[PDB]
C-alpha cells in the first residue's frame, strides 16, 4: 500500500527508508480469483514485492523451461519463519522514537509487513549483548533461589515480544536457546573459552542446569509468555574449542545425548512446561547426520527430542543431501528446523553492506535449499542492528535485514528483509512442500508449497544475470506463462478449485 523510498549506499541494490512518519507497506496476503495467478516480484533494480496478475491458460506449446507442480507428492509441513530478539536487537529497536518502533515491529509482525510467526529468545547473554550475565550468577546457588530475569528481559525483550504478539494476526512461536550456564556450573569458570558443565549427566551440576530451563520458562510464564520450543544449547560444538571468544557451553554429541536422556528431558517432562518442544544440535549442519545418529539411536534420549535445529554457517562446506537429506532418511519423523543465519560473521565478509542484493539472494537460496531438504522453518539472527552491525561486547559485528540509524530516527529495510518476506508472507504455518520438477537443467532455485486451503505458492529465485522465460504447469488447473528476470525473486499464488 506504501511504496519503498529507495536509498543507495553504493552496493548492488537499494534499502527502503523508514522513520517516525513513513515506512513502505504491503497489503495483507490474498489469493486471486480461480483462473488468475498473482506474481510478487523483487529485483536488484529496485522492485519490492510488486504485484502483477496473469491468466492461467488451458494449454501450453513450446521448448522453453517447464516447472510442473506435483501437488499429490507431499513432503514436510512448515512451522514458519522469523528472527532473534537479542539484547542488541531490543536496544536498536527501543533507540528509535515510539512511532518508528511501531513501523519496524509492523514491518516484521504485521500482515502489512512480512508476517513473522517465530521469535528466537536467548536465555540471558550472548555476543549480541553489551554485558555478560546469566539468570543465576550468585555462586553455588544449586537451589536457584537467586534465579531472576534482569532488565534486559523485563524492560527490553519481554515488552517488545508483547508488542510483536499484539501486531501478529498469526499464532507466534517463541524458541529459547542458552549460550552459557552460570560460570560456577562450568569446568573453566568463565562464560567463554573451552568449558562444559562440571561432572557428568545425572549429577547435581546437570540437574541444576536442567532446572534452570524450568526456572526460565516459569519466569517468562509469570510475564504471560509461553514457549513453543527450547534448544538443548546454542552451538554446543563451540564450547569444545580452545579460546572460544564469547558465551558457550561445550557438549560432545554423547554429552548432549546423556544430558537430554537423564536431566533435560525428564525435568521438562515432569513440569508444567511438558508440552514445550525440545530441539537438539542447534549447530552447523556439517555435524549431521553423526550428531542425529549419536542422540536418536538412544531411545531414552530420542523419546524427548521433537526436532533437530541447524545453523547455516558451514552450509558452504556441507552439501544438503549428505547432511539434511541423510538425516531425514535415517530419522524421517524428527523434524529439521533452521534456527540461526546471518551474513557478515565470516573473516572474508564485511559486517554491514547497506542494500546488498547478494545478501538477499544468500537468504532466499538458503531458505529454498532448506525447504527442498525437509526443513520445516528458517530463523534469522538479530531482528535489527546499528550501521556498524552491533552492539556486541566482543565487537563481533554482522548484518541484519533492518539497520537502525538512531541519529536520523531512521531504519533501513535491506534486500534480506524482502527475500525472507517472499516466504514468510505467503507460507502460513501448516503449509506443506509439494513436488516441482524442471523439464531441463536451469539456473533457477524454486520450491512449491500447498497452502492449508489447497492453493499453490511457488517461489522462484534467479541468482543468474540472464532473464529466464518459463511456464509453471499445474496439471489440474493449467499453465502460468511468465519470465524470471536476472537477479529477481518471485512468489506465485493461485487457487486450484
Ligand atoms: C521520513 O522519510 C520521508 C521519506 O524519506 C520524508 O519525506 C520526504 O521528505 C523529502 C524532503 O522534504 C521530500 O523530498 C523532496 O522530494 C520532492 C519530491 O516529492 C514527491 O516525489 C517523491 C519522489 O518520487 C515521492 O516519493 C513523494 O511521494 C512525493 O510525491 C522534491 O520535489 C523535492 O525537491 C525534494 O527532493 C519527499 O517528498 C518526502 N517524501 C514523502 C514520501 O513524504 C520525511 O521528511 C521523513 N520524516 C522525518 C521526520 O524526517
Ligand atoms: C550463531 C551464534 O549462536 C551467535 O552468537 C553469533 O553471533 C552468530 C554469528 N557470528 C559469528 C561470529 C564470529 N564467529 C566466531 C567463530 O567467533 N560473529 N557473529 C553465529 N555464530 C556462528 C559461529 C560459526 C563458526 C564456525 C567455525
Ligand atoms: C487445448 O488442447 C486440446 C488438445 O489438443 C485441444 O483439442 C483444445 O481445443 C485446446 N483447448 C483450448 C481451450 O485451447
Ligand atoms: C539469595 O536468595 C536467598 C533466599 O531468598 C536470600 O536470602 C539471599 O540474600 C539471596 N542472595 C543474593 C545475593 O541476592
Author numbering: 1 to 497
Can I see the authors' text?
Gaucher disease (GD) is the most common lysosomal storage disorder which is caused by inherited deficiencies in β‐glucocerebrosidase (glucosylceramidase, GCase, GBA, EC 3.2.1.45). GBA is primarily responsible for catalyzing the degradation of GlcCer by hydrolytic cleavage of the β‐glucose moiety from the aglycone to yield free ceramide and glucose. Here, we report the design, synthesis, and structural analysis of a range of cyclophellitol epoxide and aziridine inactivators and activity‐based probes (ABPs) for human β‐glucocerebrosidase (GBA).
Consequently, the O6−Cy5 tagged N‐octyl bifunctional aziridine ABP 6 was synthesised and its GBA activity and selectivity were compared to the parent Cy5 tagged cyclophellitol aziridine ABP 8 and cyclophellitol epoxide ABP 9. Specifically, the reacted cyclophellitol adopts the expected 4C1 chair conformation, with a covalent bond length of 1.47 Å to Glu340. This was sufficient to establish binding of the N‐alkyl chain to the narrow active site channel formed by Gln284, Tyr313, Lys346 and Trp348, which is consistent with the complex of N‐acyl aziridine 3. In fact, the N‐alkyl chain of ABP 6 extends through this pocket towards the surface of the protein, which may provide some indication into the binding of the fatty acid portion of the natural GlcCer substrate which is thought to project out from the protein and interact with the lipid bilayer. Unfortunately, whilst sufficient electron density for the O6‐triazole linker and subsequent amide group was observed, the Cy5 tag could not be modelled. Additionally, this binding cavity extends towards the broader hydrophobic allosteric site at the dimer interface where we reported the BODIPY tag of ABP 5 to bind. Therefore, despite demonstrating that the O6‐ and aziridine nitrogen substituents of ABP 6 are structurally exclusive and are accommodated by GBA in two unique active site clefts, ABP 6 exhibits no further improvements in potency or selectivity for GBA over the O6 mono‐functionalized ABPs.
